[PDB]
Structure formats: structure tokens, C-alpha cells
Ligand binder design. Structure first.
Ligand SMILES: *[C@@H]1O[C@H](CO)[C@@H](O[C@@H]2O[C@H](CO)[C@@H](O)[C@H](O)[C@H]2NC(C)=O)[C@H](O)[C@H]1NC(C)=O
Ligand SMILES: *[C@@H]1O[C@H](CO)[C@@H](O[C@@H]2O[C@H](CO)[C@@H](O)[C@H](O)[C@H]2NC(C)=O)[C@H](O)[C@H]1NC(C)=O
Ligand SMILES: *[C@@H]1O[C@H](CO)[C@@H](O[C@@H]2O[C@H](CO)[C@@H](O)[C@H](O)[C@H]2NC(C)=O)[C@H](O)[C@H]1NC(C)=O
Ligand SMILES: *[C@@H]1O[C@H](CO)[C@@H](O[C@@H]2O[C@H](CO)[C@@H](O)[C@H](O)[C@H]2NC(C)=O)[C@H](O)[C@H]1NC(C)=O
Ligand SMILES: [Cl-]
Ligand SMILES: [Cl-]
Ligand SMILES: [Cl-]
Ligand SMILES: [Cl-]
Ligand SMILES: [K+]
Ligand SMILES: [K+]
Lengths: 891, 891
């Protein structure tokens, strides 16, 4: 008990704002998470409007309203449970918990929609506590009284705007000077809720054994208000005379019987039924279907008979019970939905829990369950216990001006009326001390900068200019001055911030964002995708034009935070808004495997530059644009020798020549000019470090060194052999183009001609794919693939029939297959000239010949014999492309 | 005339499909662009439904409907004019013209919404030409006749579904076997439109001089149909007897007068007015306001008097004119909008124009003007010429079953009835030969692959399986079987593809996409933003749930083309969908200036590796994460010496050590490990080529070489001086950290302490910004900036007062300013030890000291005297950061 005393002194229903985030006993799941979440859910819709929803919509449709609204908040509490298990759970509120997991763009768009929903929540709680006062506590204490009979609907709006504005400016002064006394009353406001709920269930159990005696006065079908008179008779007997009652005086003109009366009043008789017959009676089968009506309609009972009258009716003057608002299904969804909001109250105390990754998912989910049980039990127990003609009666006009849910309670009706008065004034205090702390945390965070001032506070950190904005926004909801019109506006901001929490958790799971690994057990991305789809479907049931207003407000807060966050960082905004997009997309790719399922060439094309720096072989850019049809990566890297300290004047000239080609050749790519100490070295740096992160090259395209025997070129010729060794060590493909000056431009178009492929052995996967990619371009469009294979295996048939079903897997059987069959330096170059005689026998005049390229020698002294093997192999051919690669999958 | 004969033989209203794009006299603006665009605009709404819109909505609101719908298509024809002036104007249709400018994602989403809108356009034209046949040509030739009086609304739907299905399967057989004879009739279908428009304006001019004699038969206010009887009298006189007419037989029970009659028929008398009084009479002031009614209501006249009757009414049995559908404002917008669609018909002949960049913007804009003049002139001339009780009459029941717009025409009513019959059958043929060519072009384009088969054709290239899909989609619009319900579905797909054309042209202008430079004069991005906003506002006026269906269909076609286009290219789809995002964002940045307005450090941090490769100074990553708070670019580059051929085993070990730090240090960055021939060279390649494109580093962070005198390190020490020369030649900032082992980690937190800045001269812009960025991190959060300056200028006051207003511009006046005042190798190092005595006098125990760094020597023989100047300057300080840079703006 001594340990249970300082725990209840430690209880508070407040969000940890910005002062708990700058400085960054311990609570449990029950006091830290469960009780603050349950206090912010059970509110004013249960006591004022729930019996009216069960009456108008019936038991079946109002069971469907609660099943949809409690599922949108259950699937959102699973998305909040994924955020609460990811990472460290930073101290201070639910704003810092969301915005560190989902980033500042989703964090600020949720935070400003949760600020606007909390502000109009304080407007609904102030309009709710005036409605309890002026209807049930002291109805005579109203300034603007109706001067005539039809003034009741107009003069009640004037009492709401006068008393609501005077309550709001008084509520804000208590928060500004006495907020420490508001926080001590956090346990009193919980006890007013819990004792009111127990008084309802105590009255339902008592209503089965003996129902209470409440009479409801009927006349035909229609139901008449009990405010003026007391007795339900047309006439009685006093002092030996047939005297008329006070019900006679309201319909008939004079108190005397013979003068004048209403036409409907004469032909029908006054029936007196019981209002709360109990759970023993079978009224549950009666009030099970909907009774939607227009405004001003009567509140009728199905059983009692009446006779219709064609005489005219002004029902406002006579004492009747009339429907105030024209009700629908979509209207009752919008009025009910603020009764389930309060998910985010479970993570107000993220810095004061001993295990926040375990307390936050457990306490919020157990709070949605225990409140959805209360709303689903009350709908069954209001329909089965109250006559449905009393449930259709807002403002309790049939019950002498008493609260309908209060007459059901056992000890007194004053338990609920006092209990709903203090807990609604208390929820207005929490909505007006909790929403300025949220705006101050967003303002001091710096992500939205026009709102920077709202981050000023007092010496202890309490908001000053954030209160003044919140009172002015909450004043516009009091000027609407009805509880039923603020509630669809309120529901629209909570459904909007629940939409982004479910969207951002589903996108970051699919797109594999780094630092998003939620270790919560019952979480799957479809369960947030389904929560996004249901909280979007409820958002267009309520109002479709409130939904487009909320999606355009919150969508423009999202893009404004991107623009100012990139203007702050990468210099200019238009330029910076693409540099943050490229950085954030490359950090996602940083984790995965280098190759997954398919191969496609991503080429580093090497250019040679001469003195008076111009491109030596410009058609090597033309051939790159024919493989890559303006789609993939293309790094254009070239190397000039010398130190960077003195040759950076020539490096600015040579780079402008490369940009001149890539505009004309329509190469949509990148340029990496490097000034290296030797031309050998700088090609070995572009092989291993051209391109950062996910986008790195995959293939190296070169040109054949034509001048084989020269003076200074024997250093430059040897660089060709050692860069074959570099690409095979880095596991990269290599493409050598011979006679690259006689390659087609982009404007030349071949007619007829043939592309000959010679798959001997070793990586025919790439070697079929390269002419298939050329064939899609308009230069190589009308050509034919001939694919040739030499045979040293005995049979040629199963060579061919397996090869013809290689293209059945590859969908390119338009090619035709043919098989041709017939000390180291002696053995190598003799095999070349035998194979040379084979290849020009079938490919003398072809447009392009593809060949496998042999591996470079390992001893390094045979690099002149390896190059003579390649020259003898390729004699008298117009266009040769030599292909080799290492370790890749073509499917 | 001889030149005007082969031009009209060259005229055709067809889109150039895929066969004109594969092979890739000349027409002008008038025949090539203007006439095909005008033929596809003037259609069936002008003849069937325009007089009913003017009657129901009045002249003022229907002037507003045409002003909104012709502005959505005028602002879209300016966005199509920006596409037509960009680039080369590729041959073949409007699909290839849009998708080469806006990319394959916007191109395929527009193309499939323009395919679905063209298919339901063929369903409206077939339901339109059955309605002309069964109402005005032969009303007796109908299969399902109404068995009783109330069967007319139900049996007409059965005639639409039977005749519409038999027309659709017959229309598709003509296209499949005889499409060359359909294309020869393209000039006949234009002449049926133009001769019908001229017959209307010939009748309006004739109606001012003498109006025609058409009687309309009234009885009280309500208007009765003229189908059965002929004469508007209740009784007449024949063979010396008061005989009753045939109007008497339809209301009264028997032909005899005394038997029984209707109650409304007796008390009111039969009035006969003129139906088309002319432009001379002032009916224009009468039918100027709206008359929206419910279904089944009467068609009444304001002037004539009547007496009301309270007896019951079944108006369906008696001969009356009744409103068929309940009309609104939002209903008439959806019915009118298919009368303005046809912008895209101007660019059907992009391959057959002599100047396509000039013809396409001129001919489409002049076609929107000349049709918006026709619809705005007809509304004024229908209201001012036809009595409004005839305009509210669909199906011409008051006018003996004649067409209302046809009775206004001069030569005959049969000019319009025959003319609207052939041009509506002709628009159904063009909608059924033009929509399968569009689907075949999308299918053969390969951007959406589940639809690949639909690209098969005949030998000449005509679609086969694309016809069969189009008939099945057009069959579902005939099963709706009303002209007024297909038209909001039709309008929803055209407004959706006009929404993307206006959106994609506005985004690519703002975000500065490469290869988007439209050289059209009257184009601004706000004029496409305004066209996006109006074609979105019309899209929710028509139906809000048809609008959400079209935005979710077209939004999921957009993301499906992104996913399959990245799965095709970059291997895996999830991985590839981020690599296309990074490539496309870096090609936008490729064009602009390198620095625009502000500076922020984007750092290449250099790591040294020892033998048994581990990071020598791990806190140099910790200090980078405190400047960049997880926001900017961070390249982590390190160099190990040796050839890549043998040390790529150790390069895989050393790279895994770098990834171990960057996970723990929370560095969200990139790793560039380079194996170089010497450690001097590989640092000079990371300075100039680390990072591709827009995201390139800006600052180099190093560590001080502590071991100054060693054995092998005199080569490694000299690399420090020459990399100061490299960063100043590349115009990059440089940061040298001394005693980097004693730097704080991310978890250490300083309490108190001071950051001392010593701005002597030369780039105090960076030197104030560096401790301001550190101060925002939680390590350096509670510190103070002291900023010191030596003075060799005489006065210290205007030094300080200008310096204190340097921070008034920089918003960081929390710092305090203080001024301290008092053969080459003799002159250099004496100045160091004087300045050394100054700096430790004020900064002996500070947490971080910032200093300017002097320029490196030019002669290269003083690199040992430059390093001794830096060591004497920094004696006995715990944490020193030396700062220098070149050529940058800090605002
Ligand atoms: C309304 O109720 C009364 C009794 O509650 C019905 O009965 C009549 O009461 C009058 C007394 O004023 C008697 O004179 C009649 O003989 C009663 N009629 C009976 C018993 O059939 C009265 O009929 C009801 N009014 C209706 C149905 O319009
Ligand atoms: C109760 O009685 C009335 C007539 O005495 C029933 O009839 C309806 O009366 C309203 C007038 O307020 C009309 O608008 C409806 O059209 C009437 N409905 C009919 C004639 O079916 C009324 O339905 C009864 N209430 C019930 C049965 O709940
Ligand atoms: C409808 O029109 C007639 C004349 O077109 C109105 O005039 C009456 O006609 C009858 C002939 O059947 C005469 O006996 C009456 O004397 C006429 N009344 C006059 C001239 O005032 C007739 O009144 C009209 N019906 C109405 C207004 O209900
Ligand atoms: C023509 O006359 C009728 C009555 O003779 C006018 O009155 C309306 O009648 C309809 C019945 O179809 C009612 O629904 C309306 O409420 C009546 N309107 C009233 C009483 O104002 C009718 O308005 C007249 N038509 C006109 C003036 O265009
Ligand atoms: Cl509530
Ligand atoms: Cl909430
Ligand atoms: Cl049309
Ligand atoms: Cl169009
Ligand atoms: K609540
Ligand atoms: K049209």
C-alpha cells in the first residue's frame, strides 16, 4: 500500500513536450501507458450522443459503425507498435517517437494534423460542457431566451457562442498561470469517468430485476414533451366537475372545453407507456432497424395506432418532440469517430518508462480492446433496455428534461450528470495544455520555419505564443456552436494523421529503408496497408470534401518541409531537392546483394585523349548509346597523364570536349576525367572507384590499340594487357571494339546485313544478349543473328537441339544455329590461324562479328604473345567486338 | 483547282499508328491539323442534348458550363503546344508525341486513359445513333413495345441493348474487313456536320424575319404530348351536333360527354401557343433562369394560369410531357463535357506535315476557338428563339415527335436528322478503328507487359486482338443503355489524361528536367498549373467517386510502369526502383551552376590504414557525424598502396572494417576504398573523382601526421603538404584535425567548456559557420563561442562594431568578440611563436580551438619550413582544427 501511494501521486495525463527531450521513479505498463490512453479515449460521445446513435441507426447499423471505427484505430496501434519497437524510443511525447523513425517530412505532416485535431477537440469539449449545463443542470440560467415558439433552434446557438467564448478565455487563463494545479487533478478526472461507467452497468443489472418507473407520454404515434405539464390525461374530475388538465391547455385554445382545439388532438387519445422497460422485456427485437428521418419530423412509435389528419401542421408551436437534424448513415459515422481517438496518449511518457519497447505496444492495444468492449456492450445494452422512442430523443425532452443515459443509472441520474460535467471540463483542460506543447516542439525542431516564433516559452519552458494561436483556432470551432458539426471536422484531422502513420510504415517495409527494423511480433506490412485503406474509406464516408481539404493541406505540408530542408542544406532549393532525392535513394541500395537475378550491362566507356586534347575515337560513344537505349548507367571516364597541380588548365579544356560529344551522341550519362601520374594508374582507379554506392559500373568498353609498334606507345600498349587483368580481378565484363572508326553513327541506318555470333565456350550468356540489345535500336533494327559454334564433341545434333531450346527460354529463336567442324607460342598462334580461316569463311562481309576473348597470361612475360594471338585471330574483318566476363547470371 | 483536288483526296481523319513509327505529299495547317481536330469535336451532344441543357439550366448557367469546359481544353491545348514544339515531333499519332517528351511513365498512363475514353466514346455514338433512329426516323420499328402505359421508360432500355449490340458487332466487322472504304468516307462525314451547322444558322436568320408555324398544346401550366391526336380543342361542331375531339377521348373515359372525365381536365382550358416565336419576340428574358425538377414532374409554362387540384395523379397514363431524369447543375456538366473532347485529333498526322512545330499549335488552338464560338452562339440563339417549354422537352414529344433543333433549321428538319445520323455512325466508326491502333502502339512499345499480345496485327499491320478487347469494353457501355449515364464515365477518362498532360508539363518546367525546352511563345508553367486545377475541379463536379476511381486506376498504371521498367533494367525491382530514382535525379543536376547561393560542408574524410588493416584514427568519423547531423553527403575514402592484382584480398578485409565503423558511428555515407600504386597518387584521385555528378564533395577532412621524423614516413609526411596544394587547386575547403585521438565520441557529452575561434584574416565566412554546426549536436550543445581577432589596424572599435553586426546578419550574436593586440624562415617562425604566446594566453583550457591555416609554399623546397610553422603555432593545445578554403559564399 506504501508502494501504491507514491505511484498514484506520480500519475499524470500529460505529454512530455520539448523540455524532456532537451535534457535527454520509472512507471509501469498500467500507470504509464494504460491509464493515460484509457482516459483520453472515454469521453463525451458516450454520455451525450451514444444513445441517440443507437436510436436513430438501430442496433445492427450502429454495431457496424463501432466495428469500423475501432478497427481503424486497432490497425493504427499496430503501426504505432512498430514505431515503438524500432530503435531506442526517444524521450518526450509521441511526436519525437514518430519523427525519428519516419523522418522529418512524415513527422511534421503528422504533427501538424495531430495539432489541428487536438485544437478542435478542445472546441468539442467546451461545447459539450455548455450543453450539459444549459440542458440538464440549470436550463433557466440562459441569456438568450426564445421570444416565441420557433426560436428554440436559433437562440440555443447564441447561448453556445456567448458561454463558449467566455469558457475558452477562462480555460486558457487557468492553463497559463495554474497548470501545476491542473496536473494534480489528473486522477480526479479519471475517477469521474470510471465511477460514471460503473453506475451505468449497475443500472443495467438492476433493470433486469426491477425496472424503474419512468412514464413517457404519447398521443397517437407522435411523442410530446413533458416540460410544461405533469399529468397525461385529457380531462379529470375535481370538485364535482369534469375539469381539464394542463395538457388540454397546450393544444386547445382556451381552458374551457367548448372553445377550440387542435384537429389531431381530438381524434386521438393519450397513451402512457413506460420509458425504460428493462432487459427483461423484449424491446431488443423492436429497436433493431434504422429510423432515419428529416429535420422537424415526429418521433413515433410503431405499435400504438393513430388516425391521419390532412389539416395543416406547424409542429413547432405545439408541445412535441421533433428531430433536430436530418440524420443519415454517413452523418452518424462522423459524429461517432471522435470517441475512439486517443491512440497517441499511450506514448506520452516515453522517457519515464522502464521498458518502453514493451510497455507502449502492450498498454495501447489493451486500451483499444477494453474501450471497444465498452462501446459494443453499451449498444447491446441500450437497445435491449430503453424503449426506442426515448433513444431518438436528444436533450431528454420526454423525460422531464433529464439525461437518457442518466435515467438508466442506478444510484442517481446525478452521478452521470456531475460525472460527465467534470470529465468534459477536464478533457478541455488537457486539450488546451497538450496542444500548445506539441506546436512548441514542432516550432523548436526547425523543420517548418515560418512557425519559428511559436517555440518561445517561459523560464520553465511553458508555451506563451503557442497558447494564443491555439485559443484563436479553438475559437473558430466554438463559432460553429454545435457538437454535431465540429465532430466531422475533428475526425478529419485524426484520420489524416492515422493515414500517414499507416502509409509510412508500409512503404518503409516494402522499399527496405535502412534503420527500419521493427522487432514487434504481430506486425506485417499488409496490416498497415489494410489500416491505410480503412482509414481512407472512413475518410470519404464522413465527408468527401473535408477529405480533399485534409489531403491537400497535409500534402502541401509534406512538400514544404522537403523544399525548406533541401534549401537549408544543398544550397539552392530546386537543385537541392534533386540532390536529397539521389542521396536518399542510394542509401537504400547500400545494404543488399550486388547481383540478384538478372544481368544488364552498365558500362564504363574508356576514352583516349591525344595532345591538343580531343577524343581519339568518337564512335565509341555512339556504340554505347545503341546498347543502352538511354536507360542505364553510363560513366564516360578518360585519363590524361601528369600532375593535377599544373595540368588542371588542360583538364578543364578536355572535359568540355567530352560534354560536347555526349550532347550530340545523346548519351545520358556521367563524365569522370582524371589527371593521373601515369596512364596505367588512372585507368586502374576508374575500374574500382567510378560511381558511388548502388550505381556502379558493370562492364568496361575499350578500343583496340591500333598502333602496335611505335616508339613511346610500348608503354601505352602494355597498359592494354594489364587492364584485362584488372577487370577480371574485379569480376567485371570487358568489351574490346576493333576498327571502331568504322562504326555506325546514330543517324546511319543499316539495311539488311547480319550480326554473326561465335559462341565457342565460356559465357554464351552475355554473348547472346549483346546483339539482342543492339537489335532494338534503329541502326541495327533490320539485321539477322547468325550464331555459330565449333565442335570438338563427337555429335553435333544434341549440340544444336539443346541450343535451339536455349532460345526457347530466351524468347529469341529468330537466330539460326550452325555448327562448323574440321613451344606454347607455336601451339597458340597455329590454333588462331586455323580458327581465322574458319571465321572469315562464314563472316567475310558481316556487319558485326562477336567473338570470345581468351584469358590473359599469368606469367606476365607473354603479353606480346597474347596480343599476337588476338591479331592473327582477327584479320580482315570490318567490325569486331571481343567479349568476356566473369561470374554473372543471365535469365 | 487542280491543286485543290488531290488535297481533298489526301484528307483522312485517322491517327498514324505504329506502322508510321516503324518506317520512320505533305499537308498544311488547314487540312492536316485543323479539319481533323474540328471533325472530332463537333459531335452528338450539339444535336441531341444541347437544347435540353439550355432549357433546364437556363441561358446564364449553361453559359457557365461551356465557359468552364472550353477553358479546360484551351489550357490543355497550350500544354500540348509545348510538347509539339519541344524536340523533333516524332512521326505517328499523339501517343508517340507525348511519350517521348514526358517519358514512358506519363506516356503510358495518358495512353491507357485515352484508350478507355475513346472506347466509351464509341459506346456513346452507337447509343446516339439508335436514339435518332427509334425516335425520329422510324419510331414504329421497335421490337419491345410497351404493353401498358407505364412501360415506356423500361421498354426503351431493351431496344437500346438489342439494337446497340447488333450495331456494335456489325460496326466491328466493317472495320475489320473494309477499313479502306471507311477512310475514303472521311470527307462525307465532315460534310454532314458542316451542312447541318449551316442549316441551323440559316434557320435562325430566317426566324427573325418570319417565324415558322409550330403549335404547342397547353392545358393549364402542364404541356401534353401531340403524338396521338391532332387538334387542340375540347369540343367542336360537326353535322349539327356539339361533337368532342380526340383530345377528349384521352382524358375522359368515354367519347360521350356525360360519362366521366379527369378532374384537372374539367377545371382548366386548352391553350395553343407558338413553339418557335423567333428572335424578334422577347423570349430571351423569359428562359434565362434555371428550372431543375425531379423525375416525373410536369413541363410547365410560367405565364399561363391554372387552378390546382388536390385529387390524386398518375401522370404516366394520361398524355403528358414528363421530365425523364432528375436534373442538377452537376449532372449537366457531365453530360456536356464529351462535346469539347478532341484536342488530341490535331496531332494525328505528325509524320505528314511539312512543319509540325508550327502546324500543331496553330491548328488545334484555332479549332478550340471556332467550336467554342459555335457552342456559345447556339446557347444565345436557342434561348432567344425557342420557347422554353419546348427546350425542356427531350425526344420532341410536343412537336409531333420531331427534333427540336431540327424544327429551327430552314430547308427541312430532315437536313439535321439525316445529317446527325450519318455523322454519328461515322464517329462510331472512327472510334472503333482509332482506339485499337492506340492499344497496339502501347502493346508493341513494351512498357506495360501483361498486354503484350494485343500488339499482334495482320500482314499490313491492322489490329486483330485489339479489336476484340475494344468491342468487349464498348459492350459494357451499351449495356448501360442510356446516353446520359455513359457520358460522365466518358468524361472521367478524358479529364484524367488532360490532368497528367498539364501536371507533367508544369513539373518538368519547375524541376528543370533536361531535354525539356519548349520554344512556344505563349507558354508559362502557371498556365498548365491552372489547367491542372480546373480539370481537377471539373472532375469532382461531375462525380466524386468516378474521380477517385480514375485517379486510383491511373495512379496504379503509373507505378506499375515504374516497377516493370526497373525490374527490366537494374536486375531486382525493389533495388532497381531506387537506382532509377537516383539516376534520374542526378541527370537534372548535371546542367546547373556548381554553387548558387549558400555554402554547407560536404565532406570527404580521409582515413589512414596501417598494416593489419584497421582504422588509425577512428574518432575522425565521430567528428564528421557532429558537423553533418545525418543530412549531407559524406564520402569515406581511404587508400592502401600496392597493385590491385594481388592486394584485392586485403582490400576486401579493409573495406569491411570501414563498414563496421560507419554503422557504429551513425555515419550515413559512402565508402570509396582505392588500391593505388603510391599513397600520394590515390589521395589525388579521391580529391578530383569521388562522387559522381551533382553529389560531389566540397571539403576534405584530414588528420595531422603525428610522427614527423621517422624512417619511411618522410615519403608519407611529404604527402601531407602536396595534398594541401591539391585542394587549393581544385577550389575545395580543407580541415586538419590535430590530436584527433582526444576527440569526443557521440555518447560523450560536454558540460560547459568553450569553443574558441581565431579569425585573423581570410575566410571568416566558413570559420564562424563550423562551430555553429557543431553546437547543434548534443555533444557540443552546452558550449560558448569566443571569437578573437588580432589587430594591426589602428582602431579596434570599428573592428568590433562591424563584427558584432556580422552576427546580426548571421543570427548568432551569442558569441562574444574580443580583440588582442601587442631570412624568411627567421621571419616566419618568429611570427608563429609570438602568435603562439597569444593563443595559449586566452585558450589554454578550451574544448576546441579553430585557426586559419596559411597557404602552402610555391617553391616546393620549403615544405619542411611550412610544417615547422604549423607545429610552433600549435603547441600545448588539446583540440585544434585548422581551417582554410577557396572561393565560396556564406549567406
Ligand atoms: C381512446 O381510448 C378510449 C379509452 O381509453 C377509447 O374508448 C372509448 O372511451 C369513451 C370514453 O370517452 C367511451 O365513450 C367509448 O365507448 C370508448 N370506446 C370503446 C370502449 O370502444 C377510445 O375509443 C379511444 N379513441 C380512439 C380509438 O380514437
Ligand atoms: C404514425 O401515424 C402516421 C399517420 O397518423 C403515419 O403516417 C405517416 O405520416 C407522415 C406525416 O408526418 C407522412 O409523411 C407519412 O407518409 C405517413 N406514412 C404512411 C401514410 O405510410 C406514420 O407512419 C406512423 N408512424 C409509425 C408507423 O412509426
Ligand atoms: C377557358 O377559356 C374560355 C374561353 O376560351 C373562358 O371563357 C368562358 O367560355 C365559356 C364557353 O364555354 C363561356 O360560357 C363563359 O362565359 C366564358 N367566360 C368568360 C368569358 O369569362 C373560360 O372561363 C376559361 N376557363 C377558366 C378560366 O377556367
Ligand atoms: C402551374 O400550376 C401548378 C398548380 O396548378 C403550380 O403549383 C405547383 O404544383 C405542383 C404539383 O405538381 C406542386 O408540387 C408545387 O408545390 C406547386 N407550387 C406552388 C403551389 O407554388 C405550378 O407552380 C405552376 N407552374 C409554374 C408557375 O411554372
Ligand atoms: Cl470522446
Ligand atoms: Cl489519437
Ligand atoms: Cl460530341
Ligand atoms: Cl481529346
Ligand atoms: K476521445
Ligand atoms: K467530341
Amino acid at each position: 500500500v506504501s508502494s501504491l501511494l507514491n505511484k498514484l501521486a506520480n500519475y499524470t495525463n500529460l505529454s512530455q513536450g520539448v523540455v524532456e527531450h532537451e535534457e535527454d521513479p520509472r512507471m509501469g505498463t498500467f500507470i504509464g501507458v494504460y491509464l493515460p490512453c484509457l482516459q483520453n479515449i472515454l469521453g463525451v460521445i458516450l454520455f451525450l450522443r451514444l444513445t441517440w446513435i443507437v436510436g436513430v441507426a438501430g442496433v445492427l447499423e450502429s454495431f457496424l459503425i463501432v466495428a469500423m471505427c475501432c478497427t481503424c484505430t486497432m490497425l493504427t496501434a499496430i503501426s504505432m507498435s512498430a514505431i515503438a519497437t524500432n530503435g531506442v524510443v526517444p524521450a518526450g511525447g509521441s511526436y519525437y517517437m514518430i519523427s525519428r523513425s519516419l523522418g522529418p517530412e512524415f513527422g511534421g505532416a503528422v504533427g501538424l494534423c495531430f495539432y489541428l485535431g487536438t485544437t478542435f477537440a478542445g472546441a468539442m469539449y467546451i461545447l459539450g460542457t455548455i450543453e450539459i449545463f444549459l440542458t440538464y443542470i440549470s436550463p433557466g440560467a440562459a441569456i438568450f431566451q426564445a421570444e416565441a415558439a420557433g426560436g428554440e433552434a436559433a437562440a440555443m446557438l447564441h447561448n453556445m457562442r456567448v458561454y463558449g467564448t467566455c469558457t475558452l478565455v477562462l480555460m486558457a487563463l487557468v492553463v497559463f498561470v495554474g497548470v501545476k494545479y491542473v496536473n494534480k487533478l489528473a486522477l480526479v478526472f479519471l475517477a469521474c469517468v470510471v465511477l460514471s461507467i460503473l453506475a451505468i452497468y449497475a443500472g443495467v443489472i438492476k433493470s433486469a430485476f426491477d425496472p424503474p418507473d419512468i412514464p413517457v407520454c404519447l398521443l397517437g404515434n407522435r411523442t410530446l414533451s413533458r416540460r410544461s405539464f405533469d399529468a397525461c390525461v385529457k380531462a379529470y374530475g375535481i370538485h364535482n366537475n369534469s375539469a381539464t388538465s394542463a395538457l388540454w391547455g397546450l393544444f386547445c385554445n382556451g381552458s374551457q372545453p367548448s372553445a377550440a382545439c387542435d384537429e389531431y388532438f381530438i381524434q386521438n387519445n393519450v397513451t402512457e407507456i413506460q420509458g425504460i422497460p428493462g432487459a427483461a422485456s423484449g424491446v431488443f427485437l423492436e429497436n433493431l432497424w434504422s429510423t432515419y428521418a428529416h429535420a422537424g419530423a415526429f418521433v413515433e412509435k410503431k405499435g400504438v395506432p393513430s388516425v391521419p389528419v390532412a389539416e395543416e401542421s406547424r409542429a413547432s408551436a405545439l408541445p412535441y418532440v421533433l428531430t433536430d437534424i436530418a440524420a443519415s448513415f454517413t452523418l452518424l459515422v462522423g459524429i461517432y469517430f471522435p470517441s475512439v481517438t486517443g491512440i497517441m496518449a499511450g506514448s506520452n511518457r516515453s522517457g519515464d518508462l522502464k521498458d518502453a519497447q514493451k510497455s507502449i505496444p502492450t498498454g495501447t492495444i489493451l486500451a483499444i480492446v477494453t474501450t471497444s468492449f465498452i462501446y459494443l456492450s453499451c449498444i447491446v445494452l441500450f437497445g435491449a433496455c430503453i424503449e426506442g422512442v426515448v433513444l431518438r430523443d436528444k436533450f431528454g425532452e420526454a423525460l422531464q428534461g433529464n439525461l437518457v443515459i442518466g435515467m438508466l443509472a442506478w444510484p442517481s441520474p446525478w452521478v452521470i450528470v456531475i460525472g460527465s460535467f467534470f470529465s468534459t471540463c477536464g478533457a478541455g483542460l488537457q486539450s488546451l495544455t497538450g496542444a500548445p506543447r506539441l506546436l512548441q516542439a514542432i516550432a523548436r525542431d526547425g523543420i517548418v520555419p515560418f512557425l519559428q516564433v511559436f517555440g518561445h516559452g517561459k523560464a520553465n519552458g511553458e508555451p506563451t505564443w503557442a497558447l494564443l494561436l491555439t485559443v484563436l483556432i479553438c475559437e473558430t470551432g466554438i463559432l460553429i456552436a454545435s457538437l454535431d458539426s465540429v465532430a466531422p471536422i475533428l475526425s478529419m484531422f485524426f484520420l489524416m494523421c492515422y493515414l500517414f502513420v499507416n502509409l509510412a510504415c508500409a512503404v518503409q517495409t516494402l522499399l527496405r529503408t535502412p534503420n527500419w527494423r521493427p522487432r514487434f511480433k504481430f506486425y506485417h506490412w499488409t496490416l498497415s496497408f489494410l489500416g491505410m485503406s480503412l482509414c481512407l474509406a472512413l475518410m470519404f464516408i464522413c465527408s468527401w470534401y473535408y477529405a480533399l481539404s485534409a489531403m491537400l493541406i497535409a500534402g502541401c505540408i509534406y512538400k514544404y518541409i522537403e523544399y525548406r530542408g533541401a534549401e537549408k542544406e544543398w544550397g539552392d532549393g530546386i537543385r537541392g531537392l534533386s540532390l536529397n532525392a539521389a542521396r536518399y535513394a542510394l542509401l537504400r541500395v547500400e545494404h543488399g546483394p550486388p547481383h540478384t537475378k538478372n544481368w544488364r550491362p552498365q558500362v564504363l566507356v574508356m576514352l583516349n585523349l591525344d595532345a591538343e586534347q580531343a577524343v581519339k575515337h568518337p564512335r565509341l560513344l555512339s556504340f554505347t548509346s545503341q546498347l543502352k537505349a538511354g536507360k542505364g548507367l553510363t560513366i564516360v571516364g578518360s585519363v590524361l597523364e601528369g600532375t593535377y597541380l599544373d595540368k588542371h588548365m588542360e583538364a578543364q579544356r578536355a572535359e568540355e570536349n567530352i560534354r560536347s560529344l555526349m550532347s550530340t551522341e545523346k548519351t545520358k550519362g556521367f563524365c569522370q576525367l582524371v589527371v593521373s601520374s601515369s596512364l596505367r594508374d588512372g585507368m586502374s582507379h576508374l575500374i574500382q572507384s567510378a560511381g558511388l554506392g548502388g550505381l556502379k559500373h558493370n562492364t568496361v568498353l575499350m578500343a583496340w590499340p591500333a598502333s602496335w609498334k611505335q616508339e613511346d606507345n610500348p608503354f601505352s600498349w602494355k597498359n592494354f594487357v594489364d587492364t584485362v587483368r584488372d577487370t577480371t580481378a574485379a569480376h567485371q565484363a570487358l568489351l574490346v571494339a576493333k576498327n571502331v572508326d568504322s562504326f555506325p553513327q546514330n543517324q546511319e541506318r543499316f539495311g539488311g546485313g547480319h550480326i554473326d555470333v561465335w559462341w565457342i565456350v565460356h559465357d554464351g550468356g552475355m554473348l547472346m544478349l549483346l546483339p539482342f540489345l543492339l537489335r532494338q535500336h534503329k541502326v541495327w533494327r533490320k539485321c539477322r543473328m547468325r550464331i555459330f559454334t565449333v565442335a570438338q564433341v563427337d555429335d553435333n545434333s544434341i549440340q544444336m537441339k539443346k541450343d535451339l531450346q536455349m532460345f526457347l527460354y530466351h524468347l529469341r529463336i529468330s537466330a539460326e544455329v550452325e555448327v562448323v567442324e574440321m613451344q606454347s607460342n607455336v601451339r597458340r598462334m597455329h590454333t588462331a590461324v586455323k580458327l581465322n580461316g574458319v571465321v572469315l569463311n562464314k563472316s567475310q562481309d558481316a556487319q558485326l562479328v562477336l567473338l570470345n576473348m581468351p584469358g590473359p597470361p599469368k606469367n606476365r612475360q607473354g603479353d606480346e604473345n597474347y596480343m599476337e594471338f588476338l591479331e592473327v585471330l582477327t584479320e580482315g574483318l570490318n567490325r569486331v567486338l571481343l567479349v568476356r566476363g566473369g561470374g554473372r547470371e543471365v535469365i
